[PDB]
Amino acid sequence: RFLKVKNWETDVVLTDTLHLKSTLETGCTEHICMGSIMLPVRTKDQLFPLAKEFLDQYYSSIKRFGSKAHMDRLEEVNKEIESTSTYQLKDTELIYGAKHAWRNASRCVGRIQWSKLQVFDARDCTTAHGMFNYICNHVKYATNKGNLRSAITIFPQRTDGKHDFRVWNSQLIRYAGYKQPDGSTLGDPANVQFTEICIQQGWKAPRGRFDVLPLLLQANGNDPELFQIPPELVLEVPIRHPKFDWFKDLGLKWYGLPAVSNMLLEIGGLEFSACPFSGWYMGTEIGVRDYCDNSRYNILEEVAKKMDLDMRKTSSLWKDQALVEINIAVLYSFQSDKVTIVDHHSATESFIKHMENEYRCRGGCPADWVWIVPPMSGSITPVFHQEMLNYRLTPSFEYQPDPWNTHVWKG
Amino acid sequence: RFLKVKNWETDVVLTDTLHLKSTLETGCTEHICMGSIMLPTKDQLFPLAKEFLDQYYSSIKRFGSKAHMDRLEEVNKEIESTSTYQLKDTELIYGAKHAWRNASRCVGRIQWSKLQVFDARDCTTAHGMFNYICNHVKYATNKGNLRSAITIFPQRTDGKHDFRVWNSQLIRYAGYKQPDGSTLGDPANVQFTEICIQQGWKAPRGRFDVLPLLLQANGNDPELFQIPPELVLEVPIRHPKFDWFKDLGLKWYGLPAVSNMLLEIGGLEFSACPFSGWYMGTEIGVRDYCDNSRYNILEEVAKKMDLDMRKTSSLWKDQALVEINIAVLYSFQSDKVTIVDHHSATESFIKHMENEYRCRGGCPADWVWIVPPMSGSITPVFHQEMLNYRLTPSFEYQPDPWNTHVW
Numbered sequence: 001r002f003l004k005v006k007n008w009e010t011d012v013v014l015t016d017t018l019h020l021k022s023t024l025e026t027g028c029t030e031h032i033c034m035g036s037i038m039l040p041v042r043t044k045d046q047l048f049p050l051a052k053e054f055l056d057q058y059y060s061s062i063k064r065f066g067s068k069a070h071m072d073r074l075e076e077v078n079k080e081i082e083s084t085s086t087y088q089l090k091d092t093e094l095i096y097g098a099k100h101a102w103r104n105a106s107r108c109v110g111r112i113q114w115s116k117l118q119v120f121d122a123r124d125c126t127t128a129h130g131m132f133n134y135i136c137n138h139v140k141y142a143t144n145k146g147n148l149r150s151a152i153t154i155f156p157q158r159t160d161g162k163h164d165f166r167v168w169n170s171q172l173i174r175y176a177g178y179k180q181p182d183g184s185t186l187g188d189p190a191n192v193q194f195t196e197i198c199i200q201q202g203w204k205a206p207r208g209r210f211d212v213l214p215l216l217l218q219a220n221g222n223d224p225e226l227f228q229i230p231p232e233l234v235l236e237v238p239i240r241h242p243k244f245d246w247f248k249d250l251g252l253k254w255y256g257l258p259a260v261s262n263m264l265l266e267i268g269g270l271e272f273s274a275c276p277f278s279g280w281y282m283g284t285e286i287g288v289r290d291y292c293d294n295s296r297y298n299i300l301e302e303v304a305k306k307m308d309l310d311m312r313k314t315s316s317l318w319k320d321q322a323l324v325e326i327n328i329a330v331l332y333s334f335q336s337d338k339v340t341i342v343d344h345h346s347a348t349e350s351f352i353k354h355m356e357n358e359y360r361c362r363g364g365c366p367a368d369w370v371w372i373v374p375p376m377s378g379s380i381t382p383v384f385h386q387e388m389l390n391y392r393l394t395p396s397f398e399y400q401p402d403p404w405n406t407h408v409w410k411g
Numbered sequence: 412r413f414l415k416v417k418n419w420e421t422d423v424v425l426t427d428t429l430h431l432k433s434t435l436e437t438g439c440t441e442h443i444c445m446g447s448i449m450l451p452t453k454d455q456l457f458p459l460a461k462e463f464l465d466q467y468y469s470s471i472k473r474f475g476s477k478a479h480m481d482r483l484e485e486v487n488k489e490i491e492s493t494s495t496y497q498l499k500d501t502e503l504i505y506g507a508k509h510a511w512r513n514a515s516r517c518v519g520r521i522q523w524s525k526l527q528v529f530d531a532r533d534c535t536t537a538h539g540m541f542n543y544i545c546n547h548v549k550y551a552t553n554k555g556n557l558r559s560a561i562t563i564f565p566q567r568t569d570g571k572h573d574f575r576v577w578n579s580q581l582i583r584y585a586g587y588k589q590p591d592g593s594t595l596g597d598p599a600n601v602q603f604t605e606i607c608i609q610q611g612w613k614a615p616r617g618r619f620d621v622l623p624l625l626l627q628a629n630g631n632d633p634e635l636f637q638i639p640p641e642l643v644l645e646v647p648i649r650h651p652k653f654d655w656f657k658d659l660g661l662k663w664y665g666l667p668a669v670s671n672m673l674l675e676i677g678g679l680e681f682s683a684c685p686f687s688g689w690y691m692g693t694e695i696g697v698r699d700y701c702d703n704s705r706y707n708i709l710e711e712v713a714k715k716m717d718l719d720m721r722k723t724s725s726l727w728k729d730q731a732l733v734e735i736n737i738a739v740l741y742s743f744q745s746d747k748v749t750i751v752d753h754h755s756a757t758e759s760f761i762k763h764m765e766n767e768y769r770c771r772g773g774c775p776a777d778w779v780w781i782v783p784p785m786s787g788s789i790t791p792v793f794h795q796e797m798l799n800y801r802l803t804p805s806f807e808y809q810p811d812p813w814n815t816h817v818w
């Protein structure tokens with residue numbers, strides 16, 4: 001079965017056959033579309049097909065499918081499964097795995113870059129202190145003084161689900177949130193709960209608007225420990241506007257390195273529950289969502305006030321106006337300080353080119369429209385006009401529940 | 412089976428059961444989501460009628476009454492004998508309103524029950540269709556104080572006798588591709604425009620020429636008709652602060668009136684059923700003006716504002732887009748023609764979603780269409796999970812009639 005997608009600005013029609021290799025389910029049926037729903041221990045039993053399929057893919061990419069080296073690896077993984085009940089990836093398969101999970105990430109607009117991923121293998125790590133060391137190295141390497149480099153650090157895989165490695169932070173670098181007695185929040189509202197756990201674990205909170213959180217790190221199923229990232233390692237950019245001089249006086253900054261740490265990487269049936277990865281920001285993640293979501297820093301009003309917009313009717317589009325300025329400021333600031341960032345026009349255009357190349361070479365590109373279209377100026381980006389097919393390939397990145405909801409405390 | 416939708420900005424959770432009534436299909440499966448694809452007999456007819464009538468009698472709190480049973484009996488007799496049936500006025504009105512209520516792509520549905528229904532099932536000729544249409548336009552326009560309405564022509568019979576309005580909207584601007592190679596007017600209608608010309612229309616060949624109606628009755632060849640200009644309320648587009656804006660020469664019409672859809676009620680198909688409400692500003696300022704394949708004017712507007720067009724990162728496109736949309740809303744408001752802005756339309760739809768969850772057990776919504784085409788995440792619909800499913804009565808698309816009809 002061949003599936004066509006049309007771009008309605010260009011009349012370019014593409015044909016998907018890759019969706020035919022899709023295993024996992026979507027959430028949808030013939031009767032309901034769940035395309036906007038945010039979130040919709042294995043036995044040997046289920047493991048060997050997952051391994052086989054994975055190594056068939058790997059061995060095809062390298063043009064060795066059916067080789068003696070292909071067959072010997074299958075038999076060797078097989079034996080290891082029935083013997084030890086799990087198995088170890090070779091270096092090369094890990095690398096190829098981590099790249100493919102990014103490549104298959106249907107919600108990621110930055111995938112044109114999937115083949116440039118620095119993989120750090122931390123599978124020999126045993127302790128939280130060891131994890132900190134690995135994470136500091138990742139953060140320094142990826143930062144690279146502003147010339148950001150994509151990277152992933154991969155800690156040991158799940159075994160019995162009782163010995164899990166986790167990074168409890170949702171991103172390696174992120175700001176604290178503090179709910180005040182009056183009901184206001186200080187700093188980032190999205191991180192209040194996490195901030196509270198850190199405080200409980202003994203972090204002494206500076207309690208400012210932009211306090212970088214400590215790392216809370218779990219090794220081998222043990223209780224997590226607190227660590228401070230060395231500040232010299234945390235690159236930050238003060239936000240100013242190219243024409244509005246009062247902009248800097250809002251006191252805003254952001255960090256340069258987006259590094260997601262709470263996802264689960266699946267490769268050939270193996271589950272890597274600590275696999276923090278980092279790329280660089282599209283400006284709208286900060287300027288639209290982090291600053292302007294109502295449940296985040298919510299600076300829209302204060303910016304519009306300062307701009308002396310007519311705020312008495314929404315039909316003045318004062319919000320739309322304030323939002324573009326804030327986004328201009330974010331990009332100006334990053335570029336001025338030579339920190340890598342991509343605006344949303346440039347990122348979405350790149351993604352269309354990636355997507356077409358992917359249809360030409362791979363037979364498809366799973367893509368989640370709801371996520372790929374930027375959260376401002378939707379129809380002036382070419383992705384808005386692109387039809388997309390959403391489906392799940394492995395290897396993949398998956399969500400997992402927050403560890404504080406599942407962890408068995410040792411004490 | 413009882414599904415949850417969460418609003419991530421407010422944490423409000425709503426439980427959908429109304430989806431279990433879904434009859435039609437989505438295009439999606441367990442393996443592939445098609446959420447962003449634009450377009451994914453006697454025996455047949457009786458279940459359809461039955462299902463519709465059961466919901467009609469339930470809505471008037473008469474489920475299982477003699478009157479309910481008798482109508483089922485009566486429609487059933489009419490199907491078996493005539494192989495079709497007729498709706499009572501009351502059922503017609505209920506069906507049309509419900510087709511709107513169930514339109515999962517429509518943000519404006521808080522309004523669904525104030526819909527003026529004009530019954531034109533007694534119509535027999537294009538001239539008649541023209542008269543009905545003019546009456547609809549004038550009623551709906553209401554001198555700028557716009558009122559929702561639909562006009563319903565006779566239902567399909569053997570599909571050789573269809574009533575069609577060939578226009579996509581009752582009011583739209585012409586499209587002429589050039590020797591010079593570009594496009595004068597609205598490039599979306601270039602083809603319809605030549606069908607008109609190659610059917611007789613004398614085109615003024617302007618940028619904003621109201622198209623002539625091309626109406627088809629009883630499956631006949633269709634006929635041209637100019638809408639009396641006096642019935643076409645148009646708004647000249649100016650900016651509340653940029654004086655030069657007025658000199659771009661932009662105008663838009665006040666009445667959005669989709670005329671190419673098919674209205675399905677109780678298995679009955681109404682292939683000509685033009686309906687109209689009023690504009691959300693973004694439809695004109697974002698889509699009509701700025702789509703690359705539409706009037707595509709962002710380039711010219713950015714110049715006039717003297718923005719740095721050297722690089723995409725100055726967000727000059729975004730700046731100009733906002734000002735264009737400020738201007739649309741300003742013009743319509745100044746001229747007292749009804750329009751709604753995207754903030755206000757989406758806030759209304761969230762409240763409508765609330766009402767429908769508590770009163771009906773949910774509300775089909777297509778997130779991809781409902782989220783406006785600018786400033787997505789600063790409107791509350793962005794943060795609202797929605798379930799999309801197909802209920803009947805419904806509006807459906809249908810082939811452009813020039814691909815179907817025979818001369």
Ligand code: HEM
Binds near residue numbers: 107110277278342397
């Ligand atoms: C290199 C520069 C990159 C850019 C500009 C980029 C862009 C983005 C953006 C804008 C999103 C949506 C984020 C949100 O709204 O929450 C996203 C999602 C995603 N990205 Fe990328 N990305 C980049 C690199 C990467 C890398 C290196 C990986 C993994 C190796 C990755 C994997 C994903 C995944 C798994 C999601 C889904 C997040 C979720 O479902 O919560 N990204 N990316």
Ligand code: HEM
Binds near residue numbers: 514561687
């Ligand atoms: C009262 C003022 C109204 C507002 C502000 C409104 C808003 C909208 C908007 C913004 C769209 C997306 C249009 C597009 O992007 O092409 C839409 C689609 C739709 N609306 Fe409404 N609407 C209103 C009245 C109505 C009425 C009176 C009906 C029918 C009785 C209706 C039925 C639909 C249908 C069927 C669609 C989508 C059709 C498709 O799938 O292409 N609308 N509406």
Ligand SMILES: Nc1ccc2ccc(CNCCCc3cccc(F)c3)cc2n1
Binds near residue numbers: 038258279280281285
């Ligand atoms: N520039 C980049 C690169 C990769 C990224 C990967 C993930 C994210 C952030 N994802 C956060 C998702 C938070 C969330 C909340 C609720 C539900 C849900 F599914 C996700 C940002 C990136 N930004």
Ligand SMILES: Nc1ccc2ccc(CNCCCc3cccc(F)c3)cc2n1
Binds near residue numbers: 449450667687691
């Ligand atoms: N204010 C309103 C109210 C109701 C409306 C109903 C329909 C439309 C227009 N829909 C046109 C979509 C055209 C199209 C082309 C190609 C594929 C496809 F799915 C739709 C605008 C409205 N605008």
Ligand SMILES: C[C@H](O)[C@H](O)[C@H]1CNc2nc(N)[nH]c(=O)c2N1
Binds near residue numbers: 037796
């Ligand atoms: C309910 C809805 O799916 C939710 O708001 C999504 C919409 N699209 C998104 N797109 C991106 N990139 N990131 C997000 O957090 C969201 N949130």
Ligand SMILES: C[C@H](O)[C@H](O)[C@H]1CNc2nc(N)[nH]c(=O)c2N1
Binds near residue numbers: 386779
């Ligand atoms: C590819 C995508 O399905 C297509 O561009 C859609 C996106 N969302 C839309 N939303 C609305 N309201 N109207 C549209 O025409 C479209 N076009």
Ligand SMILES: [Zn+2]
Binds near residue numbers: 032033034035445
């Ligand atoms: Zn779907």
